[PDB]
């Protein structure tokens, strides 16, 4: 049972700008997604400080990077607070309408796409490298859901029958054919060391057979 939603017009515009603008520095997508994971991990850690049972769904707080060259996917997994269904529908827990407004004014007033995270909409930088993005998520207060979009103005939400997650979020980037450098170990390592060296959670780069 799959529900299809229209993006708000401002978010559709943000996504088309990310997809259509010539902009070579695409690697910042990974920094933005790792920073989102770190923010989600901070949230569940804060909640556990007064309620240890918040970690009954998993005590470990970490980030995994899982490249799969056969599927042409890069998956970013975290065990943060996760998202409810309502969060997913409401722009993946962001204030994306006001964030997009600010970001697009900054762009005409000097800034560049790499600055997107300062506007709270860094998730959408996934579309610098991905033709499709699938988000699997589990929040303590809701069931496991899958969000998905290939842009084009719409996204879907469904209950996820896949492998149960415990708690957290999995961002599956279905990479564009010309963006497969981001599945190579040495490239991913380079980007994490350049842009994510001060993230306060373990980041494990899985290797492939
Ligand atoms: C708003 C807004 N105006 N241009 C952009 C943009 C262009 C290329 C890459 C990225 Br990320 C963002 O965002």
Curated annotation (Swiss-Prot):
Effect of residue 82 to D: Abolishes ATPase activity
Compartments, as annotated in UniProt: Nucleus; Cytoplasm; Melanosome; Cell membrane
Family as reported in the entry's similarity comment: Belongs to the heat shock protein 90 family.
Domain notes: The TPR repeat-binding motif mediates interaction with TPR repeat-containing proteins like the co-chaperone STUB1.
Record PTM text: ISGylated.
Binding partners and assembly: Homodimer. Identified in NR3C1/GCR steroid receptor-chaperone complexes formed at least by NR3C1, HSP90AA1 and a variety of proteins containing TPR repeats such as FKBP4, FKBP5, PPID, PPP5C or STIP1. Forms a complex containing HSP90AA1, TSC1 and TSC2; TSC1 is required to recruit TCS2 to the complex. The closed form interacts (via the middle domain and TPR repeat-binding motif) with co-chaperone TSC1 (via C-terminus). Interacts with TOM34. Interacts with TERT; the interaction, together with PTGES3, is required for correct assembly and stabilization of the TERT holoenzyme complex. (Microbial infection) Interacts with herpes simplex virus 1 protein US11; this interaction inhibits TBK1-induced interferon production.
First and last residues shown, out of full length: 16 to 224 of 732
Role this protein plays: Molecular chaperone that promotes the maturation, structural maintenance and proper regulation of specific target proteins involved for instance in cell cycle control and signal transduction. Undergoes a functional cycle that is linked to its ATPase activity which is essential for its chaperone activity. This cycle probably induces conformational changes in the client proteins, thereby causing their activation. Interacts dynamically with various co-chaperones that modulate its substrate recognition, ATPase cycle and chaperone function. (Microbial infection) Seems to interfere with N.meningitidis NadA-mediated invasion of human cells. Decreasing HSP90 levels increases adhesion and entry of E.coli expressing NadA into human Chang cells; increasing its levels leads to decreased adhesion and invasion.
Source organism per UniProt: Homo sapiens
Residue numbers of N6-acetyllysine PTMs: 43, 69
Residues bound to ATP: 36, 78, 97, 123
Region called Interaction with NR3C1, residue ranges: 1-209
Protein name in the entry: Heat shock protein HSP 90-alpha
